[PDB]
Structure 1
Amino acid sequence: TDEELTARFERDAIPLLDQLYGGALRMTRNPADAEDLLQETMVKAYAGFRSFRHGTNLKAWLYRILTNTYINSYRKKQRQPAEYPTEQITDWQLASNAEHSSTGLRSAEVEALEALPDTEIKEALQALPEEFRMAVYYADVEGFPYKEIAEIMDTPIGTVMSRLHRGRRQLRGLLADVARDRGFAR
């Protein structure tokens, strides 16, 4: 019978769990961790209780289940990011993190200037003819695929790519000091 043996499980095992809470507390030192460990132990025990040899000492069996559930969770942590909680991560910590990040803590000024014209670049672009400037803008800034930038401007792919390569050349004619002022000459 299945359910009769679950009632037998309750009757025989529950005081064992009363003492196993103290065991898991001794081996985890955190009462919340101990309750979690004990409930995990009871999950595993009730799942595999049919495999228990009746009449023997269930104390040692359940204590081994507890020991193995502690041993498996210690290894589960070794594969997940080591986390350490704090009330409030500090500014030195926000800053240290920002030192190795792809964006960092940007200032209002930085973002103000990015929203203002890049005067060297704006004038180089305005030098180019309108169609060269457009074919360069879409492709090089807005990353549209070549057939789709042909869909814009209503011109075939060949015309768009001729305009793109020749406007890139011309704009490289200008901007020659800007590329040296910045790191693009390398």
Structure 2
Amino acid sequence: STGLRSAEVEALEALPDTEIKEALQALPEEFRMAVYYADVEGFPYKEIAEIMDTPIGTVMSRLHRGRRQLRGLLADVA
């Protein structure tokens, strides 16, 4: 599983990606929080809507549209 981690590797993993970070910053705060609570943490849709105190429709629509914007903005596989 986990290897023998040095302080070098440990300090370098603590640094930002600096590429996915820019793409997250380019999305509006609403899309960003939506995709963060949906795809990063793994909440269900109703729980994310409860966190954002907004109905299900807006949460789901923001999720889909922010997903499309990030898919069009990153376009970097390896």
Q: Place the TM-score, normalised by the shorter chain, in its bin.
A: 0.7 to 0.9
- Counterpart CA distance in 1 for 2:42 and 2:34 is 11
Cα deviation, residue 172, structure 1: 0.8
Superposed CA RMSD in Å reads 1.3
Residue number in structure 2 paired with 1:119: 18
1:116-167 deviation per Cα after TM superposition (whole angstroms, max 9, x unaligned): 1110011010000110000001111111111111111111112111111111
Cα deviation, residue 105, structure 1: 1.5
1:48-92 deviation per Cα after TM superposition (whole angstroms, max 9, x unaligned): xxxxxxxxxxxxxxxxxxxxxxxxxxxxxxxxxxxxxxxxxxxxx
- Counterpart CA distance in 2 for 1:175 and 1:135 is 17
5+ residue gaps, structure 2, are none
5+ residue gaps, structure 1, are 1-101, 179-186
- Counterpart CA distance in 2 for 1:150 and 1:164 is 11
- Counterpart CA distance in 1 for 2:39 and 2:29 is 15
Greater Rg over alpha carbons, structure: 1
Q: Does 1 or 2 have the higher relative contact order (CA < 8 Å, sep 6+)?
A: 2
**How many corresponding residue pairs?**
77
Aligned sequence identity (%): 100
Structure with greater helix percent: 1
- Counterpart CA distance in 2 for 1:109 and 1:162 is 42
TM-score by length of 2: 0.87
Cα deviation, residue 106, structure 1: 2.1
